[PDB]
Structures are given as C-alpha cells and as structure tokens.
Design an enzyme around this catalytic site. Structure first.
Site, PDB file in Angstrom:
ATOM      1  N   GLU A  92       4.453  -5.397 -11.281  1.00 12.74           N
ATOM      2  CA  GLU A  92       3.888  -4.385 -10.352  1.00 12.74           C
ATOM      3  C   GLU A  92       2.365  -4.321 -10.446  1.00 12.74           C
ATOM      4  OE1 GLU A  92       5.482  -2.904  -8.098  1.00 12.74           O
ATOM      5  OE2 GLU A  92       7.559  -2.655  -8.722  1.00 12.74           O
ATOM      6  N   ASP A 122       0.968  -2.062  -0.806  1.00 13.00           N
ATOM      7  CA  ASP A 122       1.720  -3.136  -1.445  1.00 13.00           C
ATOM      8  C   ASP A 122       1.857  -4.341  -0.520  1.00 13.00           C
ATOM      9  OD1 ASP A 122       3.660  -2.736   0.439  1.00 13.00           O
ATOM     10  OD2 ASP A 122       5.047  -1.677  -0.893  1.00 13.00           O
TER      11      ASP A 122
END
Ligand SMILES: O=[N+]([O-])c1ccc(O)cc1
Ligand SMILES: O=[N+]([O-])c1ccc(O)cc1
Length: 175
Positions: A22, A31
C-alpha cells in the site's frame, strides 16, 4: 538460503506486507483506481470530491488535518484497519473456516485481501475459497488473477496472489 535469508520470514508479518503493498503517504492522494486514500492504504471515500475526503480524514484522525497526517497517525489508522480486517474474517461464517485451514503466511494474504477489498467482496469468491480449503494453490491463484481486484490494479494485488500460490514471503523480497 543464508542465515540472513532464513531470518527474513521473522521480519515479515501482516503489517510489513500491507505496508509494502500500500505504501506510506502522509497526504491525501488518489490510488491506482483514482480514489482518495491516505496513510497505508486507508480509503477515505469513493466520492470524487476532495472535500468529502478531507471530512472523512478529520473524522478518522480526530483533528483538523487539512489533508495531511503524521507517520504516527498513519500507523494508528493502519492498525485499526488491520484489526477490522481480522475481525471481519473471524466473525464471518464463510471466511472463518477457510482462514482457519490456512497456514500462517496464507492467513496474512487472507487478511491483506480483506483489508483491500472488504469482507463481502472476498466472501463472494466461492471458487477461490473452496480451492484454498482444498489446498489447490495454483488453481486458487489463477482464479484470483481473473478478479477485477487484481486486474484493475495489478501492482497492489500481484504479491498477494503469489503468496497464496506459495505460502512463502518470496514476493516481498528484493524490493
Ligand atoms: O504497526 N505498524 O503501523 C506498522 C508496522 C510495520 C510497518 O512496516 C509499518 C507500520
Ligand atoms: O479469510 N479468508 O479465508 C480468505 C480471505 C481472502 C481470500 O482471498 C481467501 C481466503
């Protein structure tokens, strides 16, 4: 493997795994799927409105962040999210028996996937769940590689799918 290599599994755990997958970002960013995120993969909102994302952030942190947090705050939020994923698996009647059947490293890959995708999305992968309970690792991994989860954002999911195939930490080596 060298002495150092045999030590590498002890350095790996769910937090170290998700931290690689992540990343660590102290400011709101979008993202690979365009969505507002912060910290270690903390999804703030699906809305395209930055102001919604900031509102969610101040709620999650408990102060007026104006879109920015500290490393300590990111870690605290990450720990909450990891706990929520673990609790989500264990209280679920479909996921718990599969998780219980898995070895320690594949249990980390299970928590990772649930952290990324949520319980309902994961518990809908009927075939993958049966394949894992039956130790059909190659087939499970091929079936996970058909998912929108992996195909919309391969870099974030690829190491998790390799870990389900092998039950080792090899995909997390040599970053
Ligand atoms: O517990 N944590 O917040 C962690 C643990 C490991 C890591 O690499 C990053 C964060
Ligand atoms: O909790 N689980 O047993 C899981 C979770 C994710 C997954 O892809 C397979 C199994």
């Amino acid at each position: 493997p060298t002495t150092e290599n045999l030590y590498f599994q002890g350095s790996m755990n769910i937090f170290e795994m998700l931290r690689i997958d992540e990343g660590l970002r102290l400011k709101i960013y979008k993202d690979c799927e365009g969505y507002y995120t912060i910290g270690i993969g903390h999804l703030l909102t699906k809305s395209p409105d930055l102001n919604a994302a900031k509102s969610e952030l101040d709620k999650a942190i408990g102060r007026n962040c104006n879109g920015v947090i500290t490393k300590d705050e990111a870690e605290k939020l990450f720990n909450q999210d990891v706990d929520a994923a673990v609790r989500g698996i264990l209280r679920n009647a479909k996921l718990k028996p599969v998780y219980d059947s898995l070895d320690a490293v594949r249990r980390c890959a299970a928590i990772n996937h649930v952290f990324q995708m949520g319980v309902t999305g994961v518990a809908g992968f009927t075939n993958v769940l049966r394949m894992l309970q039956q130790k059909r690792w190659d087939e499970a991994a091929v079936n996970l590689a058909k998912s929108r989860w992996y195909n919309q954002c391969p870099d974030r999911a690829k190491r998790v799918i390799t870990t389900f195939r092998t039950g080792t930490w090899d995909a997390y080596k040599n970053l």
